[PDB]
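Dear all,

This email documents one entry for the complex benchmark we are building for the journal club exercise. For each entry we list the sequence lines for every component of the assembly. Then comes the predicted three-dimensional structure of the complex as a C-alpha cell string, followed by one or two observations. Please use this as the template for your own entries, and keep the labels exactly as they appear.
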Amino acid sequence: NGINEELSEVLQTLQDEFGQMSFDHQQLAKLIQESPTVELKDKLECELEALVGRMEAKANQITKVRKYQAQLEKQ
Amino acid sequence: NGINEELSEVLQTLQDEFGQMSFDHQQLAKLIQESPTVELKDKLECELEALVGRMEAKANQITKVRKYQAQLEKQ
C-alpha cells in the first residue's frame, strides 16, 4: 500500500525484535535472582549484559527510524 | 489451522503487548535520566513504576500460557 510500507515493516520488525529481547531479559534476570549458586549466576549476568547492549542499540534504531518517519509525515 | 491457534494468538498478543510496554519503559527511563528538573522526573517515575507492575504481570501470563501449552504439546 506504498513505498512507505517497507519502512513501516522495518520499524515493526525492529519493535518485534526489541520485545523478544526484553522478555528474554526479564526471564534471565529472574533466574539470576532466584539462583543460590555462583557459576550459573555469573554466566547469566554476562548473557544479560550482552542483551542490555543489544536492546539499547535496537531501541536507538527504532527512535531514529520513527523520528525519520514522522519528519517525512510532515511533508 | 486448529483450536490451539486461538491460544497461540493469545500468547502472541501478550508478547506483542509486553514488547510495547518494555519499549515505553526504556523511553521513560531515559527521559528520567536526562531530566534536570524535579517535577517531570517525579511524574515519570510514577508512570514507570506502574509500567513495571504491568510488565511483571504480563510476563507471568506469558510464562503460564506457554508452560500450559508445552505441557499440552506432550500429549
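Observations: The domain at 4-72 of chain A is CATH 1.20.58.90 (Methane Monooxygenase Hydroxylase; Chain G, domain 1). Chain A has one domain: 4-72.
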